[PDB]
Amino acid sequence: TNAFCSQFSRGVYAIFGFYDKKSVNTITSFCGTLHVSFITPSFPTDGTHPFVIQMRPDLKGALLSLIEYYQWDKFAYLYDSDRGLSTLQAVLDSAAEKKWQVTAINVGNINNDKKDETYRSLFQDLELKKERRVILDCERDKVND
Amino acid sequence: IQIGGLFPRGADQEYSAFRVGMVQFSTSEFRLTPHIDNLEVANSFAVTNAFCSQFSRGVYAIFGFYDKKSVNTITSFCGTLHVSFITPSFPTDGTHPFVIQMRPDLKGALLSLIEYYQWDKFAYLYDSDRGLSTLQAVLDSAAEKKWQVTAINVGNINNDKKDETYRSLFQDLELKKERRVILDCERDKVNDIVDQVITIGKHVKGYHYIIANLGFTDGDLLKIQFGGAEVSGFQIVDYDDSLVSKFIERWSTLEEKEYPGAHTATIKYTSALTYDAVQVMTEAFRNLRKQRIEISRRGNAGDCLANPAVPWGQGVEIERALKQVQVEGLSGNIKFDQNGKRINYTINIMELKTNGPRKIGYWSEVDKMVVTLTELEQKTVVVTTILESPYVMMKKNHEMLEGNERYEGYCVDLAAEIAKHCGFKYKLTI
Amino acid sequence: KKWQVTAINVGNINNDKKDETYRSLFQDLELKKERRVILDCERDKVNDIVDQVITIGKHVKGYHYIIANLGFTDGDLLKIQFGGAEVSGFQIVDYDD
Ligand SMILES: *[C@@H]1O[C@H](CO)[C@@H](O)[C@H](O)[C@H]1NC(C)=O
């Protein structure tokens, strides 16, 4: 908010930036209200929001197409809340429609104090249904983890 | 002592509960002098301007509402400026400072309820506007609890090959010849939802509905009352309590024009949370007075945009006071943790019956699910017969069998046919 | 017209009694094998009776109901719509106009 207000006071015509799912609503609302154009590499906002230009293409269609290509009726979906729940809603609705059995576990909230406990609980949660197919939707560090 | 007045334009009964809270809890020791602001809650900009306005006026604490879009602004700003925020609105996930959340967590109660009804497979409807938190909870628990959950977004049920695709889904879940559905949207919208469910599903019979809200008795259940469908829910306001009954009488006595929607047999749970919020703030300021801590601000608060931002030290003390407050209220026992979440709260489990809504028990953090129970067909045609082969005979193991299911023979099947044609329920007796 | 008519007064019933009297009534209609029914009621009572019918399961095929009021579309027919039982009535207000 302070950075955006600073840039507004400076009188810049356009603003380039990145945003977390926490600061996205503020950015879109402020750009919509003050008519300042925003260009971003970040995940596309979920909605019709004006004045915001998102350089990143949407992965949902590609993802669902790939799942449908590999012919998976059952898989594990691991996700973090950092980039938003849109894709989750998509794969869940489509899971309902195509009769997919999907296990969606939020890995977004995790403790570095105890990593081992949480990971053990996660994998033991997956091992009940013996999932051999997993979709990792995560920030890159978490993907590496 | 000035406080923040953030309110949605469509909030009336909660506004009335706020004013009633001000009048009832009014004391000669100190004046709360509430400054009311009407704004659009979904807009982040308007919330920012309202909060910065309240900060400009230099209010000590702030009361308001926040939509899932406006939440992070409030949490961040109150987090940086060390200002206390008290709200009836949905509890934030994770730990946040300076925010006091009046409504109890619904997750545990819902999980315990599903586990109590022993549902293996069910459908969960959700609206993307309210948020997926509870859905995320039940999905996280779904893996361990062996639950098969069909998650339907109420947002678009409209086409998808019209009825044909979604009907298979909706009537797939029939198990006991009973279909199981959890709603969790909002009261009015929930009525619309169940109606739409009956439309798209084409099957009107055998539904067990679970409304997930603290507002079970806060709306009219007459339309969903008889489909032949079971209805269960959660009630945060117990009318058996003396305080609540008295408050209900006085609430019902009030005039309609002065306070909007002021008199009704029931009260919106959010409104009751606003009232409870007024009481909690009163107790907090009183406790700040009794402990001789000076919370009065010397200078003007200034501009919220100012960098680096200047927090007030005594604000910490204010927060401490708000967290130390424990009182009795419409929501039951009111106590707070270090994170601001409600604790010791008691959420009533309700089932809708022929004579109307009743309480089957209560849920607590430590006690989990507790059934109250404590408690007859209308007409039963008595069929007499003697045990003889092969007319009426006892099944091989009738000891673990109960009722008429332990009698087999020509006369049994014959009785079943007769009673099927004449359409009466019967009991076989020797 | 040589009609055989069984006329029942549903008018006076206690709200506490509710479903029970209706159950008795419709069971007594089932034992007489009466598959044809005329409601003759305002939308409220029509809704109550229809709810009862759907609960006891008499809204299935083979039952013919005639709702006599000018309010045929005013009550809730959505719930008895998929039962398969033929429901006829009177509408004085046409949305086609
Ligand atoms: C609140 O919690 C305390 C914990 O010791 C308990 O003793 C008390 O009965 C609770 N109050 C209510 C109203 O449940």
Curated annotation (Swiss-Prot), chain C:
Post-translational modification comment from the UniProt entry: Palmitoylated. Depalmitoylated upon L-glutamate stimulation. Ubiquitinated by RNF167, leading to its degradation.
Glycan attachment positions: E86
UniProt-annotated location(s): Cell membrane; Postsynaptic cell membrane; Postsynaptic density membrane
Induction profile: Down-regulated in the pyramidal cell layer of CA1 in the hippocampus by global ischemia.
Free-text tissue specificity from the UniProt record: Detected in forebrain. Detected in dendrites of neuronal cells. Expressed in the pyramidal cell layers of CA1 and CA3 and in the granule cell layer of the dentate gyrus.
Record note on quaternary structure: Homotetramer or heterotetramer of pore-forming glutamate receptor subunits. Tetramers may be formed by the dimerization of dimers. May interact with MPP4. Forms a ternary complex with GRIP1 and CSPG4. Interacts with ATAD1 in an ATP-dependent manner. ATAD1-catalyzed ATP hydrolysis disrupts binding to ATAD1 and to GRIP1 and leads to AMPAR complex disassembly. Interacts with GRIP2. Interacts with GRIP1. Interacts with NSF via its C-terminus. Interacts with CACNG2, PICK1 and GRIP2. Interacts with GRIA1 and SYNDIG1. Part of a complex containing GRIA2, NSF and NAPA and/or NAPB.
UniProt comment concerning the protein's domains: The M4 transmembrane segment mediates tetramerization and is required for cell surface expression.
Biological function: Ionotropic glutamate receptor that functions as a ligand-gated cation channel, gated by L-glutamate and glutamatergic agonists such as alpha-amino-3-hydroxy-5-methyl-4-isoxazolepropionic acid (AMPA), quisqualic acid, and kainic acid. L-glutamate acts as an excitatory neurotransmitter at many synapses in the central nervous system and plays an important role in fast excitatory synaptic transmission.
Family from the record: Belongs to the glutamate-gated ion channel (TC 1.A.10.1) family. GRIA2 subfamily.
Note: The postsynaptic actions of L-glutamate are mediated by a variety of receptors that are named according to their selective agonists. This receptor binds AMPA (quisqualate) > L-glutamate > kainate.
Protein name: Glutamate receptor 2
Provenance organism: Rattus norvegicus
Name of the coding gene: Gria2
Whole-protein residues included: 171 to 267 of 883
